[PDB]
Design a protein around this ligand. Structure first.
Ligand code: MG
Ligand code: MG
Ligand code: MG
Ligand code: MG
Ligand code: MG
Ligand code: MG
Ligand code: MG
Ligand code: MG
Ligand code: MG
Ligand code: MG
Ligand code: MG
Ligand code: MG
Ligand code: ZN
Lengths: 178, 83, 57, 116
RNA sequence: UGCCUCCUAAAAUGUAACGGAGGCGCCCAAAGGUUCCCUCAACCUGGACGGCAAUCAGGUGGCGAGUGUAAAUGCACAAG
RNA sequence: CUUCACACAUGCUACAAUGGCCGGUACAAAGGGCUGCGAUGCCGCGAGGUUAAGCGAAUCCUUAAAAGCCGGUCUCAGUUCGGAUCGGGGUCUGCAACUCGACCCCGUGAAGUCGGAGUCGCUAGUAAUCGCAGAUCAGCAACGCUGCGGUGAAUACGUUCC
C-alpha cells in the first residue's frame, strides 16, 4: 500500500467536501493518469534515441515507454512521416501514486534554484502540466549510464471540473506553488 | 585587495552616496566610475552604471557575481567581427 | 506484455540527511537511495540604500 | 583492474598508473599510496585485491574523480557564461580567457589556420 | 494517331472539331486473402529546448483529412 | 597603445634514452646592496610570513652556480616526452591587479614523432650547450639587451661556380 494513496483517502478525500460544497462522494476529484514524455526532436538525424530516451524513463517511472511516430512530414525539421520523434510512458494505479510521491518528496525540490511551480498552468478543465529542464533529479539514473541531457514535461490529469477545484486537489497532494 | 590579509576592496566614495534614502522608498541607480571595486556580499539586488570608457552600462548584481570586480560586466572593446 | 520487458521494480527505503524517512517502490538497485534534502528540510516549504552607509561609517 | 572506473593499464608502476584517473595527478598519487601503505615501486599486475580495497575508499573521503569533477569543471565554465562577465563573453566566442595575446598566437583556443 | 477520367453532351445510353483540362506503357510478396480493433484534418487551451507547424494532455470537431499512381464516382457502417 | 578571419620577422620551449625523474655529491667568474641586502631560528607542502645578527662593504649579505661525476628507476610509448590551454585555491608589490602584473600549490595534458621551396650563423677557447649578475625597476609581461665564466668540437682539397 503506497503512502500517498492511503493519505489521499485519509484527509484529502474529506477536506474537499468542506472546501467545496459537494453533495455526493462520487463528485470528489482524483488524479486518474500521469503522462510523461520526452519528445526527442533531435532523433530525425542518426536515430539514436533507443539507448537514450527509452532506457531512462524505464528507470524513472518503472515501465518501458512507447516509441511514437510522426503524423506528417515537415521539411524544415528533416522530419519524415513514419520516424521516431517522441517517447511516452503512461502511469496508472499504484505506479501513479508512487511516482507523484517520489516527485514531490525528493525529485522536484532538488532543481537548482527552485522557487516553485506556476499555479497558472491549468488548461481550463483541471488538468495540470509542467516541464523540467534536464535529465532531472531522479536518482535511478546516473552519469555513468547517460548520454546528452534531455528534458521532459509531465501531464497530470484529474477528474476535477474547473481550475481551482483541481488546484486545491494538488495542493493537498504536495505540489508547491508560488 | 587580492590578498587574504587586507580583506576585499571597495572604494570609499562608492558607499556613502546615499544618506537619507531609508524613508522615501527609492532604489536609485549609481552613476559610478569605480570599475575596480570588488562586489562584496552586501550589494545583493542593487544596481550600478559602470563606465566602460564611452558610456555607462547598467549591471544588476543578482547573487552569483559576488566574487568578481565591478568592471567585468561593462566591456570596453567593441568588436562586431572582421567580415 | 506485462511480462519480461519492464525493468525490475521492487521495494526501496529512502532516508534523508534531516532524518525524514519513508518506504516506497522504485528501480534503485538495493534499496539504497540517499538524498540530502527532502520535502520537509528545504526552503519554499518552511521559509533603503543607506545600508551602504551603515557598514564602513 | 578497475579502481574507480578508469581501468588502469597492465604492466605499469603504481605511481604513474594511478595518474590515468581523471582527477589524480602525480602529487596526489604520492599521498594515495602513502596513507594506504602500498609501495610506489610495484607493478599493477601484482595488485592484491585486498590492497585495492584500501584505496577504493580513501578517494571518496578527500579526493575527487571522474563525473563529479568533470561536472564541477563544466559547471564553472557554464556559470561564467550566463552572468555576462568578461570571461563569459570570452568562453562563448573561443578566444583565450586569461588575458593572452590575440594578435600573433592563441592557436590552442582556436583551430589550425583558417586561410582567408 | 492506341488506352484511361472529367467538361462540351442539350437531367437514360450515344454524340463531332488541329474544341477545353490532366494522366498511362506501371507499381505491391504486401500496398493481396481473412479475422479483430481504432477514428481523422483543422481550430482552441495548458506545456523544457519548441518556433505558424515536430511529440504530450484536455476540449471542440460528422467528415473539411486520407486513398501507391490522373480525374470522376465512391468510402466515416469505412474501401482511411 | 594588450583588439583578431589572417600574413611576415626575431626568439624561447619542444618533439626525448647523448634523455625524463628521484637521492647523494664537487668545481666558477664578473657584478648589486641604506627609500636597502635579510644571515640565523621559527610557522608554512610552496610562493612567502614574522623575528633580527652583521654590513655603506676584498669584512656582511646576495651565494644553493647549473652542466658534470656516482646510484636507483622508467623501456620506445603521443609515453613518467612535451607543458600550451582551462578549472579551483593562494602569496607579494602597489591607493587599486576586471579590461591588463609576475610568482606558487592542486587538477586538466593541446599541438608536436626533427620540418617543402627557400634560407641563416660560425675558422678555436670559436660554433654548440649550461647556469649567474647587471642596467631601467614599487612590481613585472626579462624567453629581450649588455656583460661574465663552465664544459668544448668538426673540418678548410681548393678558387671552377653563387
Ligand atoms: Mg448523357
Ligand atoms: Mg438527353
Ligand atoms: Mg502524353
Ligand atoms: Mg493484411
Ligand atoms: Mg483497411
Ligand atoms: Mg606597442
Ligand atoms: Mg619547513
Ligand atoms: Mg598528432
Ligand atoms: Mg614531465
Ligand atoms: Mg619516438
Ligand atoms: Mg674569419
Ligand atoms: Mg627588477
Ligand atoms: Zn530532510
Amino acid at each position: 500500500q503506497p503512502r500517498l494513496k492511503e493519505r489521499y483517502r485519509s484527509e484529502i478525500r474529506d477536506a474537499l467536501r468542506k472546501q467545496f460544497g459537494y453533495g455526493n462522494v462520487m463528485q470528489i476529484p482524483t488524479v486518474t493518469k500521469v503522462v510523461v514524455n520526452m519528445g526527442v526532436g533531435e532523433a530525425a538525424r542518426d536515430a539514436k534515441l533507443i539507448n537514450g530516451a527509452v532506457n531512462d524513463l524505464a528507470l524513472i517511472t518503472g515501465q518501458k515507454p512507447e516509441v511514437r511516430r510522426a503524423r506528417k512530414s515537415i521539411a524544415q525539421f528533416k522530419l519524415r512521416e513514419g520516424m521516431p520523434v517522441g517517447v511516452r510512458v503512461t502511469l496508472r494505479g499504484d505506479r501513479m501514486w508512487e511516482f507523484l510521491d517520489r516527485l514531490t518528496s525528493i525529485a522536484l525540490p532538488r532543481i537548482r534554484d527552485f522557487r516553485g511551480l506556476s499555479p497558472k498552468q491549468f488548461d481550463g478543465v483541471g488538468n495540470y502540466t509542467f516541464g523540467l529542464a534536464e535529465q532531472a533529479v531522479f536518482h535511478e539514473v546516473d552519469v555513468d549510464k547517460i548520454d546528452r541531457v534531455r528534458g521532459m514535461d509531465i501531464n497530470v490529469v484529474t477528474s476535477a471540473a474547473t481550475d481551482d477545484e483541481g488546484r486545491a486537489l494538488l495542493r493537498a497532494l504536495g505540489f508547491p506553488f508560488k | 585587495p587580492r590578498s587574504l590579509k587586507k580583506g576585499p576592496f571597495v572604494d570609499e566614495h562608492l558607499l556613502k552616496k546615499v544618506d537619507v534614502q531609508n524613508e522615501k522608498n527609492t532604489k536609485q541607480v549609481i552613476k559610478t566610475w569605480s570599475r575596480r571595486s570588488t562586489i562584496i556580499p552586501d550589494f545583493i539586488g542593487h544596481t550600478f552604471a559602470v563606465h566602460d570608457g564611452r558610456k555607462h552600462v547598467p549591471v544588476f548584481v543578482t547573487e552569483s557575481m559576488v566574487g568578481h570586480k565591478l568592471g567585468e560586466f561593462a566591456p570596453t572593446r567593441t568588436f562586431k567581427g572582421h567580415i | 506484455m506485462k511480462s519480461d520487458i519492464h525493468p525490475a521494480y521492487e521495494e526501496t527505503t529512502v532516508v534523508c540527511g534531516c532524518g525524514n524517512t519513508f518506504q516506497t517502490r522504485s528501480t534503485k538497485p538495493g534499496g539504497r537511495i540517499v538524498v540530502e534534502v527532502c520535502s520537509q528540510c528545504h526552503p519554499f516549504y518552511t521559509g533603503g540604500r543607506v545600508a551602504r552607509f551603515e557598514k564602513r561609517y | 583492474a578497475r579502481l574507480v572506473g578508469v581501468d588502469l593499464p597492465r604492466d605499469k608502476r603504481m605511481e604513474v598508473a594511478l595518474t590515468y584517473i581523471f582527477g589524480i595527478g602525480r602529487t596526489r598519487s604520492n599521498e594515495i599510496l602513502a596513507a594506504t601503505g602500498i609501495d610506489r615501486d610495484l607493478r599493477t599486475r601484482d595488485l592484491t585485491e585486498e590492497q585495492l580495497i584500501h584505496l577504493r575508499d580513501y578517494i571518496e573521503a578527500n579526493l575527487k574523480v571522474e563525473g563529479d569533477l568533470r561536472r564541477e569543471v563544466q559547471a564553472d565554465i557554464r556559470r561564467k557564461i550566463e552572468i555576462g562577465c568578461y570571461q563569459g563573453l570570452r568562453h562563448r566566442r573561443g578566444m583565450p580567457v586569461r588575458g593572452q595575446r590575440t594578435k600573433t598566437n592563441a592557436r590552442t583556443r582556436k583551430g589550425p589556420k583558417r586561410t582567408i
